[PDB]
Coordinates of C-alpha atoms in Angstrom, one line a residue:
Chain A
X1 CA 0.0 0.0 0.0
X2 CA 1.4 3.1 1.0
X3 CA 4.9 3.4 2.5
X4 CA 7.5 6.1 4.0
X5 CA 11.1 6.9 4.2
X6 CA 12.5 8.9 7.3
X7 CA 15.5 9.8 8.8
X8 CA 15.4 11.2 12.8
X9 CA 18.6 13.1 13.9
X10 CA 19.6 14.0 17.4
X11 CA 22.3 16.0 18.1
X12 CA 22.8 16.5 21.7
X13 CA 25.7 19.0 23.7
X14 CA 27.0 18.1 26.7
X15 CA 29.2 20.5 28.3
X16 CA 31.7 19.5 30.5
X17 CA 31.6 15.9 28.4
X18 CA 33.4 16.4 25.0
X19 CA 31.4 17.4 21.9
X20 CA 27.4 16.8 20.7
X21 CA 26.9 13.5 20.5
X22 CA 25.1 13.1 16.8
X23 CA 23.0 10.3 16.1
X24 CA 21.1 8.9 12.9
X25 CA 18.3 6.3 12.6
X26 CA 16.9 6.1 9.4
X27 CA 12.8 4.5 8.9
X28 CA 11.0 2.3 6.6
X29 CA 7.6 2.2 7.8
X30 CA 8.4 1.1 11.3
X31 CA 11.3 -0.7 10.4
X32 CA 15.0 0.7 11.3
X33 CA 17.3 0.1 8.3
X34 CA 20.4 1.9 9.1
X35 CA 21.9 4.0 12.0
X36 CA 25.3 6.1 12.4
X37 CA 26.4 7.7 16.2
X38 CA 29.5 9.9 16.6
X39 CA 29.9 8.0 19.6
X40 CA 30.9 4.7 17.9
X41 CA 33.8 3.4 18.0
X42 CA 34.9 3.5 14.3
X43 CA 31.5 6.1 13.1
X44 CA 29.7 4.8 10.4
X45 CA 26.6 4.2 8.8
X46 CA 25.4 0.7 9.8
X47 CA 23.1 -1.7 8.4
X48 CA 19.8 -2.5 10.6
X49 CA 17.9 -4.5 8.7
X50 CA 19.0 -7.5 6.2
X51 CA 17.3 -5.7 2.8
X52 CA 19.8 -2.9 3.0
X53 CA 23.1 -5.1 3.5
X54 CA 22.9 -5.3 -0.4
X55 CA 24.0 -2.2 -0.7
X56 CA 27.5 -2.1 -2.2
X57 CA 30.9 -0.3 -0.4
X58 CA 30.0 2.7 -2.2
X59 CA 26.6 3.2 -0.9
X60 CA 28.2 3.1 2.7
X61 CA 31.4 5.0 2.4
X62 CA 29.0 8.1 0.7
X63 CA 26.1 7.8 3.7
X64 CA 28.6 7.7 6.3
X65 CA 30.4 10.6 4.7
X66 CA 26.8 12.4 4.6
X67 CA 26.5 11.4 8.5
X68 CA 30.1 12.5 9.3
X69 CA 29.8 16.0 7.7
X70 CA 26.1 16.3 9.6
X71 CA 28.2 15.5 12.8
X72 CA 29.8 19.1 12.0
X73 CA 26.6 20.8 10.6
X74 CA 24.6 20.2 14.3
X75 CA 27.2 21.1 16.3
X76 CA 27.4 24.3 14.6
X77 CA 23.5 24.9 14.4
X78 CA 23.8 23.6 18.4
X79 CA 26.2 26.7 19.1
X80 CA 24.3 29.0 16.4
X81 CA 21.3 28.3 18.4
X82 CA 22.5 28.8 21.8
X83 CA 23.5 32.5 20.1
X84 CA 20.1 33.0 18.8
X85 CA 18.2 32.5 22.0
X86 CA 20.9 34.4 24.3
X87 CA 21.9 31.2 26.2
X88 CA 24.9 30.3 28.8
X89 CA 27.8 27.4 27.3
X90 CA 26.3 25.5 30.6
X91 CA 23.7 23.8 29.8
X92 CA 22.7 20.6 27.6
X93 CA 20.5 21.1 24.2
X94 CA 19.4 18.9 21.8
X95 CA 18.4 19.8 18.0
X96 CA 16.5 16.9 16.6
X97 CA 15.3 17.1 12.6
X98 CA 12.8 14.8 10.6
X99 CA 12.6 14.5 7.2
X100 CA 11.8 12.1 4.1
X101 CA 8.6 11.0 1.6
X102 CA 5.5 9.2 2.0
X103 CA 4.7 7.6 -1.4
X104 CA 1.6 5.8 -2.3
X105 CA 0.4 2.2 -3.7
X106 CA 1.9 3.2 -7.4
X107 CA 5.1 4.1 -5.8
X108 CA 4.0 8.5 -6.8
X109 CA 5.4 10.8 -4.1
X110 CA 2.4 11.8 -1.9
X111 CA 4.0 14.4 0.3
X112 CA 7.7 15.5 1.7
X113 CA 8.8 16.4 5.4
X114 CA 12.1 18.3 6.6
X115 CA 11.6 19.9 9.9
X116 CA 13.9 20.7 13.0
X117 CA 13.1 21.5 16.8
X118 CA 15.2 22.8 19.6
X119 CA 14.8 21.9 23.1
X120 CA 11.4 19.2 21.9
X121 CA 10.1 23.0 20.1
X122 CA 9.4 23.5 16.8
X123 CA 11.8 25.4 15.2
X124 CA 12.1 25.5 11.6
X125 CA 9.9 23.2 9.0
X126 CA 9.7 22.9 5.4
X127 CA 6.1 23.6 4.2
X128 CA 4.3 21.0 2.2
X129 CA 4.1 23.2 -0.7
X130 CA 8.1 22.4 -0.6
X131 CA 9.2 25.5 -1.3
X132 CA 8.4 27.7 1.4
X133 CA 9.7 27.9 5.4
X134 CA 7.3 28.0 8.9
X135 CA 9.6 29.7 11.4
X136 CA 8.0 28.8 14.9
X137 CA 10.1 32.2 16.1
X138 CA 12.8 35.3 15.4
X139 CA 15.4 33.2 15.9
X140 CA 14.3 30.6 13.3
X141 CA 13.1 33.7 11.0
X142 CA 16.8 34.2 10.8
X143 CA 17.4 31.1 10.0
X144 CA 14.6 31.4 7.3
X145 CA 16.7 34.1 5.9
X146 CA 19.5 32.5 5.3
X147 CA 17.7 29.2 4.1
X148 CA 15.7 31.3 1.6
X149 CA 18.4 33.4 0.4
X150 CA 20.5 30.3 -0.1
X151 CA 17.6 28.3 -1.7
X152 CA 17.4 25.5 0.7
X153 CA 13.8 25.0 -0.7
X154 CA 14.7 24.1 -4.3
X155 CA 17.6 21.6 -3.0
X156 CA 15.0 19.8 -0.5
X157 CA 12.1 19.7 -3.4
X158 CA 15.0 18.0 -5.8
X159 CA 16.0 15.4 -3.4
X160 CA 11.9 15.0 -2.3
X161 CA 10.9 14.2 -5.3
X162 CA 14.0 12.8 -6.6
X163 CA 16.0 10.5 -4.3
X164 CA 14.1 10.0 -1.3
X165 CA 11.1 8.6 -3.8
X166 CA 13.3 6.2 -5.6
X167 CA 15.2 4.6 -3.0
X168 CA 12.7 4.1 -1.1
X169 CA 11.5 2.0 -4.7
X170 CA 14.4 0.1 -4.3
X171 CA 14.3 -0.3 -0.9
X172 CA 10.5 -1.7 -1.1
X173 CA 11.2 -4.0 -3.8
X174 CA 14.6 -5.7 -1.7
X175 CA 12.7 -6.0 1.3
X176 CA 9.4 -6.9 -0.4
X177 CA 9.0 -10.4 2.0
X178 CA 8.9 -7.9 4.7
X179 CA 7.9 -4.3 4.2
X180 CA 5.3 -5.3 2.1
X181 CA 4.0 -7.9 4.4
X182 CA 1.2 -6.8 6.7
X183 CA 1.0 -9.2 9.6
X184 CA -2.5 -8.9 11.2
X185 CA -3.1 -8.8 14.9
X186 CA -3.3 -11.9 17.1
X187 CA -6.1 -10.7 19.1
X188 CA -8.3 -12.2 22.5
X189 CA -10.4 -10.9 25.5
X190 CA -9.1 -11.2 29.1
X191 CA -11.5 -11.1 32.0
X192 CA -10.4 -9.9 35.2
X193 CA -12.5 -9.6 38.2
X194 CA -11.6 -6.3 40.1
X195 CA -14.2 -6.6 43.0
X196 CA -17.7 -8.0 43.4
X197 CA -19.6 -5.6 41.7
X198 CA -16.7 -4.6 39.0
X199 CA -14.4 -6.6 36.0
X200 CA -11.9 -5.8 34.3
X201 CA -12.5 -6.6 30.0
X202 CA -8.8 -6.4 28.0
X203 CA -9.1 -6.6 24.3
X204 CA -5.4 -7.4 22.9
X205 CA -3.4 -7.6 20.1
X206 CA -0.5 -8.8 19.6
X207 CA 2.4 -9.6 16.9
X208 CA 0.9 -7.4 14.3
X209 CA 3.3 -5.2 11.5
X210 CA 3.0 -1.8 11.1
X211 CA 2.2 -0.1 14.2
X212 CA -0.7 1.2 13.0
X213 CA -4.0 -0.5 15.0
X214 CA -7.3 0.9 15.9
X215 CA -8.3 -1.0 19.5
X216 CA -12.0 0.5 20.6
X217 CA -14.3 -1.1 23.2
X218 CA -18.4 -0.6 22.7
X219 CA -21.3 -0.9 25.4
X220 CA -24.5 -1.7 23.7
X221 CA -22.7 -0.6 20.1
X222 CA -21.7 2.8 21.6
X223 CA -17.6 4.2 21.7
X224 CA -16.7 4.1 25.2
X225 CA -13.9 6.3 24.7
X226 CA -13.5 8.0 28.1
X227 CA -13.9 5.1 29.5
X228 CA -11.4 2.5 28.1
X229 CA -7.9 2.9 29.2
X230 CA -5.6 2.3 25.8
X231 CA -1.9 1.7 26.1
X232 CA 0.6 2.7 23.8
X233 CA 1.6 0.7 21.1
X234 CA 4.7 -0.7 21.7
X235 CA 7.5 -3.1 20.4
X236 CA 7.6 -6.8 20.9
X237 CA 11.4 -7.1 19.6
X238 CA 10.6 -9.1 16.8
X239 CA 9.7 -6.2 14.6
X240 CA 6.1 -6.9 15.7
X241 CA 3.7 -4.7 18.1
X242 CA 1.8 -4.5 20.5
X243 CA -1.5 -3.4 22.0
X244 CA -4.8 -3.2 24.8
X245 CA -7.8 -1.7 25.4
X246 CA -9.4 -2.5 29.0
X247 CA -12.7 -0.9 30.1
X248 CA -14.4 -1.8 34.0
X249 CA -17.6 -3.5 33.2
X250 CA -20.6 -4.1 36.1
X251 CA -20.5 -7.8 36.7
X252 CA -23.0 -10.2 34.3
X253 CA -22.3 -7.4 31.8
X254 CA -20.1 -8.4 30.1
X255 CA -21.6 -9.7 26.9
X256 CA -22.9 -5.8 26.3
X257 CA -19.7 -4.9 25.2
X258 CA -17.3 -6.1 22.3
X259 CA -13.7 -4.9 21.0
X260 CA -13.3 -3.7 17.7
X261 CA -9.8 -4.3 16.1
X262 CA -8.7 -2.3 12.4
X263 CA -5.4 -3.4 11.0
X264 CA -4.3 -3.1 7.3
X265 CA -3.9 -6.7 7.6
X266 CA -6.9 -7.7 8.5
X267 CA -9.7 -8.3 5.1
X268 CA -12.7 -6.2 7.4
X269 CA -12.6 -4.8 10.6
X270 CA -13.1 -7.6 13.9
X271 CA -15.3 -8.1 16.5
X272 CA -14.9 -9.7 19.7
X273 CA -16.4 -10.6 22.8
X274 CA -15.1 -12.2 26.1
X275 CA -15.5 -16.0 25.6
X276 CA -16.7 -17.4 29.1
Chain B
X1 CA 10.4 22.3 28.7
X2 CA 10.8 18.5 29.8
X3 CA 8.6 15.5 29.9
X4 CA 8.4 12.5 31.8
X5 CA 9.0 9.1 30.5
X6 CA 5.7 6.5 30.0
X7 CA 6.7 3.1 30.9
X8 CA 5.1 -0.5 30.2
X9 CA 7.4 -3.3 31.6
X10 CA 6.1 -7.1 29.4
X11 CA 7.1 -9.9 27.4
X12 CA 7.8 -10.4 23.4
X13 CA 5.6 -13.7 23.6
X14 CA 2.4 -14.6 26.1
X15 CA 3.8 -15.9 29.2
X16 CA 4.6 -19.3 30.0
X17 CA 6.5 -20.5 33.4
X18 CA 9.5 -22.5 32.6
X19 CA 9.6 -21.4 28.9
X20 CA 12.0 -18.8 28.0
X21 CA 11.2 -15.3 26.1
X22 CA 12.3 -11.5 26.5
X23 CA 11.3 -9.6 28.8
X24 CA 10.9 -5.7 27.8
X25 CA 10.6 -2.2 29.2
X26 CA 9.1 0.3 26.9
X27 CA 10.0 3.7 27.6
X28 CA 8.3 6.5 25.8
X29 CA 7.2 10.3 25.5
X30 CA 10.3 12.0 27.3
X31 CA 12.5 14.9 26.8
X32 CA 15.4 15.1 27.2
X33 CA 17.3 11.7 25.8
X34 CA 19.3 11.0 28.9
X35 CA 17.4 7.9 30.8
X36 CA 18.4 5.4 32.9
X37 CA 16.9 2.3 32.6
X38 CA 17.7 -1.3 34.2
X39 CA 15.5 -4.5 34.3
X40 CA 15.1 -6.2 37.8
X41 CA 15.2 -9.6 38.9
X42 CA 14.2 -10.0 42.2
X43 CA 15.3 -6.5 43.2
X44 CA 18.5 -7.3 41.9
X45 CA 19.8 -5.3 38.6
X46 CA 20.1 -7.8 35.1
X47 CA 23.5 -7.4 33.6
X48 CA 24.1 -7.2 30.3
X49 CA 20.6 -6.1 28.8
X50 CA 20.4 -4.6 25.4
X51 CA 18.6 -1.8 24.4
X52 CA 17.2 -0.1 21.1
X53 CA 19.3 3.0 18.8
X54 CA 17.8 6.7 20.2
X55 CA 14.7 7.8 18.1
X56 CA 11.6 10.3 18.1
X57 CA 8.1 10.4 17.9
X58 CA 6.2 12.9 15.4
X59 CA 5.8 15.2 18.9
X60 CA 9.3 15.1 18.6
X61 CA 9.5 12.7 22.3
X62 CA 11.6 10.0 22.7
X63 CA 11.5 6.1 22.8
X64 CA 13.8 3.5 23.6
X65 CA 13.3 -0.2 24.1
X66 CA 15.1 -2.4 26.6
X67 CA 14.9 -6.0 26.5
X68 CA 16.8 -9.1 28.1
X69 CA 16.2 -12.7 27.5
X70 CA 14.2 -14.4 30.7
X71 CA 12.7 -17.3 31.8
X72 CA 9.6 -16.2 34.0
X73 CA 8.3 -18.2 36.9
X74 CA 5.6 -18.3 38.9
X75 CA 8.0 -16.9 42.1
X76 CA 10.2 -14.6 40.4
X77 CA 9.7 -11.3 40.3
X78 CA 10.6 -8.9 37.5
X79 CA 10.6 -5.0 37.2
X80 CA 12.0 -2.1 35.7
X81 CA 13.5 0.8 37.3
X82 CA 13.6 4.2 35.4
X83 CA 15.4 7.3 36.2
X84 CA 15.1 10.8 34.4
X85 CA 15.4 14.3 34.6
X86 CA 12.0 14.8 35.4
X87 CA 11.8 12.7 38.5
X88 CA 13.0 12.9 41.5
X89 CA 13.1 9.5 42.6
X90 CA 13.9 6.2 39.9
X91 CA 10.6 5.0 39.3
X92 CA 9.5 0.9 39.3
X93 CA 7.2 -0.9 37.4
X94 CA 6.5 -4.3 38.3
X95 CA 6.0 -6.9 34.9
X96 CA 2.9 -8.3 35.3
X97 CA 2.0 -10.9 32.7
X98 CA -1.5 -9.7 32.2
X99 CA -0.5 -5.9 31.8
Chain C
X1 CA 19.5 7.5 1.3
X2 CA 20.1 10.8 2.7
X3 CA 21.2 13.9 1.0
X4 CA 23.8 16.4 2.5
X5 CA 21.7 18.8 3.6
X6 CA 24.9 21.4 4.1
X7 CA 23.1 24.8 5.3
X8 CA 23.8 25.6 8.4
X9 CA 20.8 27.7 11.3

C-alpha cells in the first residue's frame, strides 16, 4: 500500500563531556534500516535491517560521509542556536530534525517532510508546498533568511521528489517479503474480576506489523472512549507490536460490550467478545 | 520544557512459566534523551541487557526499548527501574503478565 | 538515502 522513508537526527551538547553526540536512525515504515552515532567506536553508517546489506561499499562509504559532515553541521547549528536565543555554554541542548517522503500504492510521491526543533520546540519546518519555510520564532526567522536566500527550498524539493522517492522504490522492492507484508493482529479478551460488583474486559493484540492499530471497546454498540484505558503501542522485539484496550464492566455485563480491532492486515474490521 | 518518560514493563511472547522469552521495558514520550533504565530480577539489577538506537516520535519525544532474554516463573519477580530528569526519585514498574 | 543537507541555522 502506502509506505515512507524517514530519517530522525539528534544531536545532543553536553558540556563538561566532550562534543554533541550526533546520532542517525533512518525508517522504513516502522522498520529501522540503518543508524550512524558519533559516539561509535569507528562512526559509520550501519546496516539495521537485512534488505539494505545489499547495498554495495560505495553506498556506505558516501552515507557515512553524509553522516560525518552532519556531525559538524549540528554542532554548529547547536552553538548557532545557543546565540540566537541568548543562552549560557552551561547547559545541555538537543536539536533533533525529521525529514523524508511518504509515497503511495503506485510508488508517486504523496508528500515530503524536513523539519527541525530545539529543546522538543518546533523550530524550523519545510512547508508542504516544498518551497516555502514555517519559522516557529525570530530566531528561526533568521534562519529562514538565510535558508531562503540560499535556496534551501529548491535543494529539499530535488531530493523530495528525486531520491528519497526512488530509493525508497528500491528499498521496497529488496525487502518486499517484509515491508510489504502486513501481519494482522493476534487478538483475545481477558477477563479480570476487580471486585464483586466490578471486571476488568482487556481486548489485545499482539504480533501485528505496522504499528498502525485501531483497539475500541463498545457498550450496547456505543464508543466508550472515556472510559477504556488504551496503552501505547509498543515493540515486541521481533519487529512486531503491540497493543490493549481495557474498560471496568458491572458484573453479568459483560456480553454488552465487544472490541473492535482495524489493522491493514486484516480483510474487514473484527469483532470480539469475552469467551466465558 | 521537559517531559516524563511513560513506561510498560512485558514480554515479546504470552507468558509461559519455565519457557524462555524476552522480557521488555518500553519507555516513551520523554524529553530530554538521557534515561536510565535497568531490568530487575528480584530487586537485583540484570546485567548485560540490550537496548534499542535513540529515536523520536512525530511530537518530537523520545523512545527506547530495553529488553533481556528471561525465563519467568511463577516466584520470580521482574521490574523495571527508570530514572530521568523529570523525576526525583527512579521509578519501578513491576512486569505483570497480564499488563 | 540521505542527501547532505549542508546549510547551516
Amino acid at each position: 500500500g502506502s509506505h515512507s522513508m524517514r530519517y530522525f537526527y539528534t544531536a545532543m551538547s553536553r558540556p563538561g563531556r566532550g562534543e554533541p553526540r550526533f546520532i542517525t536512525v533512518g525508517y522504513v515504515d516502522d522498520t529501522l534500516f540503518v543508524r550512524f552515532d558519533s559516539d561509535a567506536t569507528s562512526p559509520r553508517k550501519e546496516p539495521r535491517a537485512p534488505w539494505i546489506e545489499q547495498e554495495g561499499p560505495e553506498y556506505w562509504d558516501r552515507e557515512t560521509q553524509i553522516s560525518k559532515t552532519n556531525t559538524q553541521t549540528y554542532r554548529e547549528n547547536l552553538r548557532t542556536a545557543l546565540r540566537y536565543y541568548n543562552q549560557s555554554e552551561a547547559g545541555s541542548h538537543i536539536i533533533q530534525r525529521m525529514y523524508g517522503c511518504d509515497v503511495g500504492p503506485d510508488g508517486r510521491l504523496l508528500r515530503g517532510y524536513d523539519q527541525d526543533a530545539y529543546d522538543g520546540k518546533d523550530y524550523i519546518a519545510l512547508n508542504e508546498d516544498l518551497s516555502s519555510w514555517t519559522a516557529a520564532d525570530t530566531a528561526a526567522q533568521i534562519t529562514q533568511r538565510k535558508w531562503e536566500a540560499a535556496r534551501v527550498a529548491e535543494q529539499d524539493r530535488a531530493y523530495l521528489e528525486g531520491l528519497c522517492v526512488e530509493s525508497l522504490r528500491r528499498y521496497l522492492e529488496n525487502g518486499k517479503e517484509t515491508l510489504q507484508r502486513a501481519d494482522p493482529p493476534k487478538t483475545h479478551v481477558t477477563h479480570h474480576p476487580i471486585s464483586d460488583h466490578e471486571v476488568t474486559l482487556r481486548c489485545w493484540a499482539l504480533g501485528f506489523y505496522p504499528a498502525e492499530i485501531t483497539l475500541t471497546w463498545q457498550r450496547d454498540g456505543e464508543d466508550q472512549t472515556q472510559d477504556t484505558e488504551l496503552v501505547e503501542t509498543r515493540p515486541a522485539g521481533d519487529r512486531t507490536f503491540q497493543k490493549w484496550a481495557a474498560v471496568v464492566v458491572p458484573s453479568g455485563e459483560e456480553q454488552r460490550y465487544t472490541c473492535h480491532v482495524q489493522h491493514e492486515g486484516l480483510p474487514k474490521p473484527l469483532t470480539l467478545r469475552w469467551e466465558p | 520544557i521537559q517531559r516524563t518518560p511513560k513506561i510498560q514493563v512485558y514480554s515479546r511472547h504470552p507468558a509461559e512459566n519455565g519457557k524462555s522469552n524476552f522480557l521488555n521495558c518500553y519507555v516513551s514520550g520523554f524529553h530530554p534523551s538521557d534515561i536510565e533504565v535497568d531490568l530487575l530480577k528480584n530487586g537485583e539489577r540484570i546485567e548485560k541487557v540490550e537496548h534499542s538506537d535513540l529515536s523520536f516520535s512525530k511530537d518530537w519525544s523520545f523512545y527506547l526499548l530495553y529488553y533481556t532474554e528471561f525465563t519467568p516463573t511463577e516466584k520470580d519477580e521482574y521490574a523495571c527501574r527508570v530514572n530521568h530528569v523529570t523525576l526525583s526519585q527512579p521509578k519501578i514498574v513491576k512486569w505483570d503478565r497480564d499488563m | 538515502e540521505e542527501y547532505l543537507q549542508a546549510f547551516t541555522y
